[PDB]
Symmetry: D3
Subunit: 150 residues, 6 copies
């Protein structure tokens, strides 16, 4: 189904490095539809909720701290297979190991400064979308380019 959504957040390092438009352009080119978009400085509450899966790990504190250290551009993209496809376009956790062509492969060097977050599953996408966005902030009717889908 073509109404799958994923959550992506350009983290404060990616925003600070002027990569917001380069990243959005990659997903627009791919044919995914921008369905929500805003810049914000995450609060502590949202951050801990965002990273709640790690909350028993020692590196949780660092994650929460970093993501609330500056502006973040949160976005929701819609399309077929968007959750896995967007991960593939991101690269792997370690930017040094991410293939050239991928966002982290092209732009990143350090795990802790790896530019962008993308949901790792449809279920984490749905939780993250409902976390970061109000329903009113999301397009209800989406029309993609007619040349994208059969």
């Amino acid at each position: 189904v073509n109404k799958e959504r994923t959550f992506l957040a350009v983290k404060p390092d990616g925003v600070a490095r002027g990569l917001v438009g380069e990243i959005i352009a990659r997903y627009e080119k791919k044919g995914f539809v921008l369905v929500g978009l805003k810049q914000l400085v995450p609060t502590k509450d949202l951050a801990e909720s965002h990273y709640a899966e790690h909350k028993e790990r020692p590196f949780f504190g660092g994650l929460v701290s970093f993501i609330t250290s500056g502006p973040v551009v949160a976005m929701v993209f819609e399309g077929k297979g968007v959750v896995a496809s967007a991960r593939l376009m991101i690269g792997v956790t370690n930017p040094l190991a991410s293939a050239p062509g991928s966002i982290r492969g092209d732009f990143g060097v350090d795990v802790g400064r790896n530019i962008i977050h993308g949901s790792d599953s449809v279920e984490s996408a749905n939780r993250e979308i409902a976390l970061w966005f109000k329903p009113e902030e999301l397009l209800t009717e989406v029309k993609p380019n007619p040349n994208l889908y059969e």
Copy 2:
């Protein structure tokens, strides 16, 4: 002063043509700081307020209609001379007459589908920013790259 702001809105044709990231990237490269960013489908009220200067002209109706016909990515950029600089980067009203290199010069062909709005003056910028954004939606402290300003 380096805290000048302008309002830009990628209009629904620019959003539909997948130009959002290409446009944001141009301003990020230039060194202007993203200070507000959201996607929305303008209501009639906001549109008529946005285009209130034309409200006695016959083409007002068309402007209001078009801009509420689909999603718009509204953004506020901060920097020295950003209001005039952003206009220059946009091109002139008619895309056909806009120099190659400019957004409308590179991407547009028709006055009525000219992709992007930018404030034409600091005073229209301030009015437009206060129209489209809540104060809470705007970064209060902005840090540009230190290599941009003397």
Copy 3:
């Protein structure tokens, strides 16, 4: 040998999405030589001949229909290992699974709208070239950049 040729066709979705020049540029950059190039709207006959290998499958009809639904930019590129290299630059059948960096990895989302055709073998290349092009439409003498080949 450096006179290997492959057949590529930007299908009507890739032409409609404005990707013709982006695709040709990728092969020119690589150092492959454009040896034939034309836009056409395939007839039914050429399409069924092009897809003759699938003619006993149920999806044959859809292939023939789609490719004759609009303009196609057919081209022949020459170079060492061009048939396999051009496939690699294309990606795999499913665009969602194609690596970032590849044409389908960068631009596509749906199997049925996967932008471009490339010959899958030298023998299918030779058949396809002889199908889509007259001999007179192909450069006989090709000179590549001297800095490409040892």
Copy 4:
């Protein structure tokens, strides 16, 4: 009117320098529709006919010689104001004087190697199109992106 056409030919220097896709991409991005496209090595007859306006000047011989010295990618683009717009995107006769952003401004250095030809008027466009293309080689029905024209 939106059915205006112009003739462009990437001359043999632009083809030899691998600029065919970069040039086509610029016009596709702009929103002009590719309406005819082929590679050919011009004969003497076509060249002298193409440059017939100069035929009483001494530099006519050089023009005819150069353009028949190698492959040329001839194309016809359709759109509103395409004849003047395409010239603007090309630059001026001397590449050294052409603004950055324009094809000749970005890529050229010498008048005699200035990459690309574009019709200088609708009437020279119509003559050139009818010269270089058969009617059957041109799309009869053109659909642009709906987001281009009001």
Copy 5:
């Protein structure tokens, strides 16, 4: 004549902002030949000599200070009309007033952080080249692409 040379230096702001390759690529694309290239941190002596024309102005101190504050990538490019052409590709002193398409028009916002230096005349080019480079650091025989010059 095609052996004209100009001196360009990516100043420490352009080096710090990761613009070295973007700038070199613009001149390579244009068809100018790289004839000398090195990174260095200018000493005070070289800086004051470089900016000797301003030495009676109050802003001389700031120029010398800034250029010795970090690495600089000095380069010499060769080509027809390269001195004026390279200036045109740079833009004007004030980046805010430089046309989109030009280096300063695309990337700069502040006079004091305007990214790049280019010789303003053949005579200042010759003085600057002899200042920043040893003769042994410069290619003696230059071959451009044969498709650049008539």
Copy 6:
């Protein structure tokens, strides 16, 4: 550690094809710091020393010959994991087999004309750096973007 260095040399084919800036830009974007940079035409001595590992193989002569056949842009980049990361960004020995996205995957077609050299190990990097550069030619203090490293 973030002070790892690698040696890269754009070989004479990559310099002749105008790829110097495209290659430097890829590493700058990645966040690696340019720590040394110069153009030179390698002598025989440096070449044989550079390729000393192959000196008992028959193809040694060809390597030495090619690399001294024209200008080379030698550079040293600094960053975490830069030696392996830079190899990954290069591709594999055979350009035809290198993934799209990588330098050799995007630009190369022939093993003997594969554009660029990168150290294959920290130890070969250290030997190569000390070969091609004087200590004075290398930045001693390097500051990367603060948004790159945790």
